[PDB]
Structure formats: C-alpha cells, structure tokens
Amino acid sequence: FVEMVDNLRGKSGQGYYVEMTVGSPPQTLNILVDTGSSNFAVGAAPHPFLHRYYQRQLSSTYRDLRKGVYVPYTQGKWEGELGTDLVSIPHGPNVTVRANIAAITESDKFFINGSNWEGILGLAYAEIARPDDSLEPFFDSLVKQTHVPNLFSLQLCGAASVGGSMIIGGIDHSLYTGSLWYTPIRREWYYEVIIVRVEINGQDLKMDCKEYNYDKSIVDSGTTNLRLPKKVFEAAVKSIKAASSTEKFPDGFWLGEQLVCWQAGTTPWNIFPVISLYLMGEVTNQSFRITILPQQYLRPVDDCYKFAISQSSTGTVMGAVIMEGFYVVFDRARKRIGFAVSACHVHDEFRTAAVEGPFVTLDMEDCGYN
Numbered sequence: 001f002v003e004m005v006d007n008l009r010g011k012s013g014q015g016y017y018v019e020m021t022v023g024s025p026p027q028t029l030n031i032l033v034d035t036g037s038s039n040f041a042v043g044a045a046p047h048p049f050l051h052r053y054y055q056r057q058l059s060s061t062y063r064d065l066r067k068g069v070y071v072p073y074t075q076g077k078w079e080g081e082l083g084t085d086l087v088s089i090p091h092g093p094n095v096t097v098r099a100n101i102a103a104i105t106e107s108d109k110f111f112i113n114g115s116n117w118e119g120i121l122g123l124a125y126a127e128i129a130r131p132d133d134s135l136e137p138f139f140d141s142l143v144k145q146t147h148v149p150n151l152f153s154l155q156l157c158g159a160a161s162v163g164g165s166m167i168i169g170g171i172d173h174s175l176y177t178g179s180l181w182y183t184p185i186r187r188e189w190y191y192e193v194i195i196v197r198v199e200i201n202g203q204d205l206k207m208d209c210k211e212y213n214y215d216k217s218i219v220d221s222g223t224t225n226l227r228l229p230k231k232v233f234e235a236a237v238k239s240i241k242a243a244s245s246t247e248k249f250p251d252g253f254w255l256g257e258q259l260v261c262w263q264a265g266t267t268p269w270n271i272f273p274v275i276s277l278y279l280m281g282e283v284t285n286q287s288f289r290i291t292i293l294p295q296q297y298l299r300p301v302d303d304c305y306k307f308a309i310s311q312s313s314t315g316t317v318m319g320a321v322i323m324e325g326f327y328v329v330f331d332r333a334r335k336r337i338g339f340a341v342s343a344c345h346v347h348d349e350f351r352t353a354a355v356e357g358p359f360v361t362l363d364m365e366d367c368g369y370n
Helices: 136-144 209-211 230-243
Strands: 007-012 018-020 027-034 040-041 063-072 077-088 096-108 119-122 152-156 159-167 178-186 195-202 217-220 224-229 260-261 275-282 286-292 298-300 303-306 309-313 316-318 327-329 336-342 354-359
Touching: 018 119, 018 159, 027 354, 040 327, 077 159, 096 136, 159 209, 178 327, 178 354, 195 209, 195 230, 195 286, 209 230, 230 309, 275 316
Parallel strands: 027 119, 040 096, 217 316, 224 309
Antiparallel strands: 007 018, 007 159, 018 027, 018 077, 040 119, 063 077, 077 096, 152 159, 152 327, 178 336, 195 275, 224 316, 260 303, 275 286, 286 354, 298 303, 327 336, 336 354
16 A cells, blocks of 8 residues: 555646556556546547547557447537556556546547646446446456455645545555544445535534535545535535634635635634534444534635635535545445545644544434435
8 A cells, every 4th residue: 555655646726646557568647536427538639738648559458349438518528439458557556457448539628738637537436427337437347357445545635736645445544543434325326425414613504404415415536626505605605704704805705716815824724614514424323524624625826725615506515625634435345435534634733623423413314315
C-alpha cells in the first residue's frame, strides 16, 4: 500500500487523476478517478486540449468490439468505439487485466483545456454504465481476473496542484486517524448513501430527513462541491449567513460566483460554522456523523476563497469538499462506505473535524427517496 500512497494528482477544481497504462507496448495516460460514473474512456484522437491520447492501432492486444458508445450530458458529451485491451496501474496493485475501454473519438464540453488528464475511470457500478449495464466496469474486471480484494479507498488531500491517494484492494492505517465508521451503500448504481440528519454548529436544520436525499445522495470524487438540494441549500446558507453575520458578503459569493478575500493569515474562521452530516449506520436505528470544518467548504484560489457549497436539483452530492476532510473506504465486498478523519485534512487550532457515533435515529429507511 505504501507504493500507492500519493498516486493521485490534479489541479484545484479539475478533479484527481491516477496514472494508467493501456495496450502492448504500454501507453501511459493520466485518468480521472470518478466514483460518480462507470465507464473507462480515454481520448483516442488528437483533440487540441490533450497532452496525449490512446492509439488503438499501436496496441497488439487491442480488440475492437465493433460497437459504438454515446454519453450525453447537460449540454455536451463524448462518443467513441468500444473495445478491450490490457490495463495496468503503475502505482497500484502489481497486476494487468483486460478491461473494456471506450476510445473517445469525438466530444464536446468534456475535456478541459489546460488539464493534465486524458481519460476518465468510472468506479461506480454497471447499472449506470453506457451503452447499458452489460458493459463491465474496470473495477469489476479487476476483481474477477485477479485476487485484489473488492474494495478501494480514497484520501483526497487537495492543496494550485492537489494530491491524494487511491489505495486499491485495501485500507492504509497511516491515511486516517480515529475510528472508521460505515454507512450502507443503499443500492449498487451510484455510490448511494442515506443522510438522516444535518446540523450547523451543533444545531439541527430541522427538516424531514427526506429533504436530505431528494432524490438521492452520492459520494462523488468527480464533483468538487458539496451539493445540496434546493430546500436544503437555502436552509444551510441562511444558517451559515447567520453564524457569520458578523460580516456581510455579496450575494454573488453565496452562489460561488464572487469570491471573498482577507489579509494573509487574518481569515475569520471562528465565524464560519462547522457542518454535521449524520449517515445511516450498519445497525438498526444506529447512525454516525461526520463534521466538516469551514476550511472544507471555503476553498482557496492575500487570502481569497470561494463558497464551495452549491445547490443541486439531482440530490445531494458529496464531492471533494466533503471527501477531502475524510478517508473514504468504498467497501464493495460488504456494500458499505467507511468514513474516518483524514490524516491530510486541514484543521483549525480550536476546532477539529471528526467521525463519531453511535447515535440513535429511528425510521431511517423513511429518509430514502422512493
């Protein structure tokens, strides 16, 4: 696991990528680690934004599946040719597997001009893979063709150049402090979880827990901000505004549009509240909570910051803002996600993030959207 430490890189806001090799001889490419999708797709044509791209033609182990794939988004997309090839992770388990690979030949609003990654590694389940759920995801192929345990864990450390660790096949004790608590993976499509309670500075937001998961909550390393549903967002903001009322901020800030600044070293942290999210526990009526320091939802860019919390219309999204404060264990074998304080989280001198429990929370099932 020591050789896998620090195997993730990236730029603030551009996601984390891991190095991978494809084909024979091996072709090196930087790949986005995305627990919010399920396809393994790499640029395979010279799009001007790419540092490099996969060249099927030059791989003797490449097998054309003679089938296309099309992945649409809000206003963009990516499309390409399906196939398989030998895949390896230089700074991961010492193995090589044959996995499905989408060779992206055309795309819009997908690649980022200036980024250092050329592909995406979807670590979610087949249920949401494209063209359909018959296209086996990389991790499923990794587990079936080798003896790597069915689980991986992520330590996203953020700050500009960011860094992190993706431990494949296990858990690394040196990456976290304290206890590791688990929440059930409600269903195997996205890494869906259930939030049963939210508190700001210890005070309950007082909302039917359903509002917290309307219409789903997921852990997504591919999303930057903590995204909360409308109603939840407004309540959270109002509460954060009140706590920091000691100062005023232009509406554009609470929208992540305009940033706020302070002299270097004079950031009024004490005025920004800590946020607590209670997650369904492993035991009936049992739950636990994770707390976020304001240093998590106020990301750098003297000292200036942007509000890293935004509203959602597609459920709660626990992205880098949340994940960077914790060591997240995606225990696929046991359909659960574990959280523990990260050994690389940024912390105040008077306040400390945490993962704790147990708590008694009744009718948690009702919190889930149906």
